[PDB]
Enzyme design. Structure first.
Site, mmCIF file in Angstrom:
data_model
loop_
_atom_site.group_PDB
_atom_site.id
_atom_site.type_symbol
_atom_site.label_atom_id
_atom_site.label_comp_id
_atom_site.label_asym_id
_atom_site.label_seq_id
_atom_site.Cartn_x
_atom_site.Cartn_y
_atom_site.Cartn_z
ATOM 1 N N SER G 170 26.039 -26.775 37.845
ATOM 2 C CA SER G 170 27.049 -26.945 36.824
ATOM 3 C C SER G 170 26.391 -27.153 35.524
ATOM 4 O O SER G 170 25.647 -28.110 35.395
ATOM 5 N N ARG G 171 26.839 -26.499 34.362
ATOM 6 C CA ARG G 171 26.259 -26.628 33.063
ATOM 7 C C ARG G 171 27.197 -27.615 32.302
ATOM 8 O O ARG G 171 26.870 -28.800 32.026
ATOM 9 N N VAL G 172 28.383 -27.146 31.883
ATOM 10 C CA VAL G 172 29.313 -27.865 30.983
ATOM 11 C C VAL G 172 30.459 -28.309 31.816
ATOM 12 O O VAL G 172 31.474 -28.840 31.332
ATOM 13 N N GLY G 173 30.297 -28.073 33.159
ATOM 14 C CA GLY G 173 31.237 -28.331 34.180
ATOM 15 C C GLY G 173 31.067 -29.661 34.828
ATOM 16 O O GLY G 173 31.782 -30.061 35.740
#
Lengths: 48, 101, 236, 120, 303, 265, 303
Positions: G170-173
């Site tokens: 997950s990045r911005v999740g």
């Protein structure tokens, strides 16, 4: 010569008897060398 | 990770020094008069005794030794383009003296 | 087939041979007609033509066309577009094999690579799924056990280890069922064994009533009841 | 009990009397023999259990009676009927070898083994 | 003989061999040579089929060897690409399948109402390095029933024919076969399979059983070397194979396998060519025939 | 290329597998004989131990170690090497005799000074009395072994068939016989001294045993190593199958585009 | 739930399954099945997504599942080639990218102005054997943030769900989660990517520390599994991950993981539901609540 050398010859002598098996002849047979060492430094290996 | 006998390892050992002898960095060319010696040392097996890590020390220092002492010898190889019996014996004495490193 | 289901209320089992030649036949039609071949040289109309076929095969509210198909891949390749499309419509694989038939066991159906996307607790019964898995896990562990049993030797088994081997080899023979079609060759009348009686039987091997019944008497039998007679026969 | 072991084969014994030839003359063991250590010479060995006799041809080794009735025998060879004439030919070659030259020690073992063999 | 993409020199060789061994007076070579334009080469297996078909139709028989269908494919490429059909796989025409498939359907044994006749076939395909993941081999492979797979490695090693038995398969199998020859080669199929698995075990120390397999095995392979352009009759196939199966070649050293075969045949033909004639005609072996034959094989090895 | 290069490699991976497979079978063949001897060897050794028990034990030190010449038997060579290295740290002056080439090379770097006697051509041969006897007879003159009050041999004990554990045991000396308080129960005269004969003989009889055990764990280890090589090599096989598959799809794709670009103009 | 390219039979099974599970009264199903022609499949995610946006601009949350975007690419492929547009890389058009990026950015979380609406997305990919060298999978991946890499190998070997966590990111999740659900899972993500490295070399070093990690890690993987089509409640999942994160799977062995789970939950509510009321409403754990759970989990571990 050592006591075990003496016995080693004696076993070899006893199979010289009229009956024998594959492992006996091998148990007395050596095509093995040994490398002399002292100190890295070595005089030349010679038949064992 | 094969087990290697002495006959095989003469090749492998000879080779590793040679490989290192070839080795060059970027931006440092040299003239023919001063590549003719270096190749003699590798091919005629003067590096076999010399340790693999310090072949590169030796290449540079050998070249400084010759510049002081045998600069006459190098001019002859440059001007005449061939190494004579006399040039070959001289070159062989020079490698020898510096074969300790 | 569609006339038997919709207008006579009867089930139809429709076989198809190579579906490798279905894809092959369309690519040429495409090419000649002035269409341009797609991925792997194949017809640009591959997915839609297949989709129409396999939504013409379904359970209607009178009757049903079920289809058993034969799948042959382009020189051992499963990444190509044409098997992939096929596999989407398929819900089971029956994986026939040579290694099973060399033990003189027909059915040829390799147990381990026989799998369904409808074999589950909710579809076939909870019991059914569970009987089917235990029998699968047993063959799976047997197979792995045999692997190191060859190299080390066969003296290595404990009491526990051989329990998996015994139950497995009882099933391995038990697999072979005389086929009606193949009646001459076996010499033994073909038998049929309904769905409820299939579950029950394998349960009996699980409770070990059939874990001492001779191993050469499982050869070419039917239902649970049947192999009592063969067992008497090997012994007597 | 009595043991026989070799590099290449193991022998398992029980035995009543074991009869031995050692570098102290000859040694006999019957039931519990009070512990003795003699290294066995080139030997012909007999074992009897009851009125049965069983015989062995032994190349020498070591013998040790332990107190509990257990005769530990080890030898590099040591059956008697199995062992079985070319040793006379080997003696002639050993006599040749000595002339030039262990060869002395080898021919001494051969003569020792040949007297022992003649007993059979 | 269907000379497809073969030079005039190449067929001149075939002609000369065929005449020497007297086979000219039933043989035909339909010739579309390599210089000969791409339409003639395309139509050459189709033409030749017709010449056969006329024999088949009348109740008679023939065997047509299409050599090599690989070249048929290149010829079609020329035709197809100029007339602008887009190619499918590997830039070989997309209906090339259709071309090969249409031809090979004629190669079958007709019913009793057609007057019992046939056109037998033995198609030939050439592979670049053994690659059968290619378009032209894969199609043929499926279309045909049977394959003979020659292995480059076998060839070098002096084994001619250089058939690799694992990938050589029959798909109609022993339906048509002489029974006698079938009997004494069931054993040969299993022996040879086994010998393969234990040849990669001997790339040193081995068990007594496996080492038996090896020696016994080697003698069987050495029998399967058959010299090129030397026909053999059923009455002479059956004896040889029998010797090896029953283990009478075990004694016979490898240098002696080649001589063994010929000498043995002539000995059987003098002593008793009845048994040989019975094999040929009956096409079968009996408990009575086998006793004499086995006994004859034993006497012969001993001397 | 991609295409050819993938394929060429898949042929190498197969040859690597086939050969590792091959060794696993000859290794097995050898192993059956290695065990058979070993049992017999172990039976001789107990006969000495029995004596030493009732005798009570009163045993500078020698180290001998036993491997083979031949490589690729596993971590047998270097695990035994390290277990030698502990007792060259409990005394940094202990003398190492190396039986086999493989163990020799590694020890020689760590201490260049110690190697006095070493033995070759024992690795490609099975343990046999002739060899142990000659090694034993030489041991006495060169290393003055009997003068030492403790001698130790190291080997790899094949405890179970997927394992080997490096182990050591103590070989006795002439001193032990002399000063034990139960050399008194056992009887002999001054006619033969059991010290000069029994030390020499049990130097070899103990030595042979270690030699069979060491070898057996080594051929066993090699079998395991070569089995583990097939599992890894398969995984590489399956990966190169996918590499071949990707490569095929791109070759077909790119060829079409070029034909099309040609038709299009 | 956009069903593109699936069997009309499956979709009818899916419509009934949802009405048993009483969930069809807040979901729509869109259909462009395999039978139904390619240009309708092309347009199927677009048309459905308009319907999704209508919920999103009324300022309420939504979801849309695009099954399978690899089949939108095929649908659009066939339409594209028959219009004479030459194939791109991997025989799919080079304008495929356009469809997915335009499509995907109409599912986005809006600001306070737009009613703080959202339309979430879970795009479902048909991978060509776990390869990510292929064009269509990478195109969907580069537009999107986060991946839920799933393994076939794992699914077969009794991990349901078979959600591999090594190539899942997950990045911005990662700012989705409220505090309870940041505390409890704390650094479990990290620990099972130390576990992967620990098992590469467990075919070097073997230490208690490495062994301990490997035992925790296997035990942890077992713990992740949960029954399918009855998804365990979120409040209910909060205690279970605490245990494992806090290393309390050194008292439970792998065979008993399932048994402990239900018995531990039953225990917790009857003993103390206070803990669970807190997490239902607050959705943030405090240190005191956390400790109270630790105290309770160890009690259950002993007996």
């Amino acid at each position: 010569i050592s006591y075990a050398a003496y016995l080693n010859v004696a076993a070899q002598a006893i199979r010289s008897t009229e009956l024998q098996t594959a492992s006996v002849l091998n148990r007395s047979q050596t095509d093995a060398f040994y490398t002399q060492y002292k100190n890295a430094s070595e005089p030349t290996p010679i038949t064992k | 990770g094969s087990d290697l006998d002495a006959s095989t390892k003469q090749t492998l050992v000879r080779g590793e020094r040679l490989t290192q002898l070839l080795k060059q960095n970027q931006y440092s060319p040299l003239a023919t008069e001063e590549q003719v010696p270096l190749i003699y040392a590798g091919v005629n097996g003067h590096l076999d005794g010399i340790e693999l890590s310090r072949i590169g020390e030796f290449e540079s220092s050998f070249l400084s030794y010759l510049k002081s002492n045998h600069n006459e010898l190098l001019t002859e190889i440059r001007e005449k383009g061939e190494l004579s019996k006399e040039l070959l014996a001289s070159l062989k004495s020079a490698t020898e003296s510096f074969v300790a490193t | 087939a569609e006339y038997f289901r919709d207008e006579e209320g009867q089930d139809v089992l429709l076989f198809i041979d190579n579906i490798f030649r279905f894809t092959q036949a369309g690519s040429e039609v495409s090419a000649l007609l002035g269409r341009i071949p797609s991925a792997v040289g194949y017809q640009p109309t591959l997915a839609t033509d297949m989709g129409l076929l396999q939504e013409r095969i379904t359970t209607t509210k009178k009757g049903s066309v079920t289809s058993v198909q034969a799948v042959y891949v382009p020189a051992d390749d499963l990444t190509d577009p044409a098997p992939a499309t096929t596999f989407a419509h398929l819900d089971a694989t029956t994986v026939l094999s040579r290694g099973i038939s060399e033990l003189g066991i027909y059915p040829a159906v390799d147990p381990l690579d026989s799998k369904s996307r409808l074999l589950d607790a909710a579809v076939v019964g909870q019991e059914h799924y569970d009987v089917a898995s235990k029998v699968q896990e047993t063959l799976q562990t047997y197979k792995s056990l045999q692997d190191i049993i060859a190299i080390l030797g066969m003296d290595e088994l404990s009491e526990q280890d051989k329990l998996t081997v015994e139950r497995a080899r009882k099933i391995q023979r038990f697999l072979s069922q005389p086929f009606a079609v193949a009646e001459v060759f076996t010499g033994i009348p073909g038998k049929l064994v309904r769905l409820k009686d299939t579950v029950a039987s394998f349960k009996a091997v699980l409770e070990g009533k059939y874990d001492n019944i001779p191993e050469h008497a499982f050869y070419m039998v039917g239902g649970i009841e049947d192999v009592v007679a063969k067992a008497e026969k090997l012994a007597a | 009990k009595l043991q026989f072991a070799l590099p290449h084969e193991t022998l398992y014994s029980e035995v009543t009397q074991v009869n031995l030839p050692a570098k102290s003359g000859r040694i006999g063991v019957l039931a519990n023999h009070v512990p003795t250590v003699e290294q066995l010479l080139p030997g012909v060995v007999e074992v009897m259990e009851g009125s049965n006799s069983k015989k062995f041809f032994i190349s020498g080794g070591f013998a040790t009676v332990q107190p509990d009735s257990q005769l530990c025998v080890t030898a590099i060879e040591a059956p008697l009927e199995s062992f079985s004439e070319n040793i006379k030919n080997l003696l002639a070659e050993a006599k040749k070898n000595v002339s030039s030259s262990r060869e002395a020690a080898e021919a001494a073992i051969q003569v020792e083994v040949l007297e022992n063999l003649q007993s059979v | 003989y269907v000379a497809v993409g073969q030079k005039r020199s190449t067929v001149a060789q075939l002609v000369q061999t065929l005449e020497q061994h007297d086979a000219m007076k039933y043989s035909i070579i339909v010739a579309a040579t390599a210089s000969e334009a791409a339409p003639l080469q395309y139509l050459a297996p189709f033409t030749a089929a017709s010449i056969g078909e006329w024999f088949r139709d009348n109740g008679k028989h023939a065997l047509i060897v299409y050599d090599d269908l690989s070249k048929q494919a290149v010829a079609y490429r020329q035709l197809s690409l100029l007339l602008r059909r887009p190619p499918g796989r590997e830039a070989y025409p997309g209906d090339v399948f259709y071309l090969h498939s249409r031809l090979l359907e004629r190669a079958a044994k007709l019913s009793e109402k057609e007057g019992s006749g046939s056109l037998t076939a033995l198609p030939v395909i050439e592979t670049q390095g053994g690659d059968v993941s290619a378009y032209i081999p894969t199609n043929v492979i499926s279309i045909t029933d049977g394959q003979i797979f020659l292995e480059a490695e076998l060839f070098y090693k002096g084994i001619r024919p250089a058939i690799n038995v694992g990938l050589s398969v029959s798909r109609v199998g022993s339906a048509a076969q002489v029974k006698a020859l079938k009997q004494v080669a069931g054993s040969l199929k299993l022996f040879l399979a086994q010998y393969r698995e234990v040849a990669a075990f001997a790339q040193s120390d081995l068990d007594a059983s496996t080492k038996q397999t090896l020696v016994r095995g080697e003698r069987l392979t050495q029998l399967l070397k058959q010299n090129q352009y030397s026909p053999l009759a059923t009455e002479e196939q059956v004896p040889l194979i029998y010797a090896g199966v029953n283990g009478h070649l075990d004694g016979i050293e490898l240098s002696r396998i080649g001589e063994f075969e010929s000498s043995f045949l002539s000995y059987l033909k003098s002593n008793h060519n009845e048994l040989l004639t019975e094999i040929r005609e009956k096409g079968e072996l009996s408990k009575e025939l086998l006793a004499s034959l086995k006994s004859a094989t034993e006497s012969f090895v001993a001397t | 290329a991609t295409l050819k290069e993938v394929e060429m490699r898949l042929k190498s991976i197969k040859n690597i597998e086939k050969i590792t497979k091959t060794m696993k079978i000859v290794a097995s063949t050898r192993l059956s004989k290695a065990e058979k001897a070993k049992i017999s060897a172990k039976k001789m050794d107990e006969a000495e131990q029995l004596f030493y028990k009732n005798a009570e034990t009163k045993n500078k030190e020698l180290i001998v170690a036993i491997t083979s010449d031949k490589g690729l038997c596993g971590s047998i060579h270097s695990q035994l090497a390290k277990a030698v290295r502990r007792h060259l740290n409990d005394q940094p002056n202990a003398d190492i005799v190396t039986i086999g080439d493989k163990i020799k090379m590694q020890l020689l770097r760590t201490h260049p000074n110690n190697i006095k006697l070493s033995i070759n051509g024992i690795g490609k041969d099975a343990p046999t009395f002739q060899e142990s006897a000659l090694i034993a007879d030489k041991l006495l003159s060169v290393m003055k072994a009997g003068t030492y009050p403790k001698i130790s041999i190291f080997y790899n004990d094949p405890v179970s068939s997927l394992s080997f554990e490096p182990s050591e045991k103590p070989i006795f000396n002439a001193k032990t016989i002399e000063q034990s308080p139960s050399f008194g129960k056992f009887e002999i005269d001054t006619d033969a001294n059991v010290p000069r004969d029994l030390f020499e003989y049990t130097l070899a009889n103990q030595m042979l045993t270690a030699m069979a055990q060491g070898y057996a764990a080594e051929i066993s280890a090699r079998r395991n190593a070569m089995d583990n090589a097939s599992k890894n090599a398969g995984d590489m096989i399956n990966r190169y199958s996918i590499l071949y598959n990707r490569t095929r799809q791109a070759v077909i794709t790119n060829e079409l585009v070029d034909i099309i670009t040609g038709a299009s103009s």
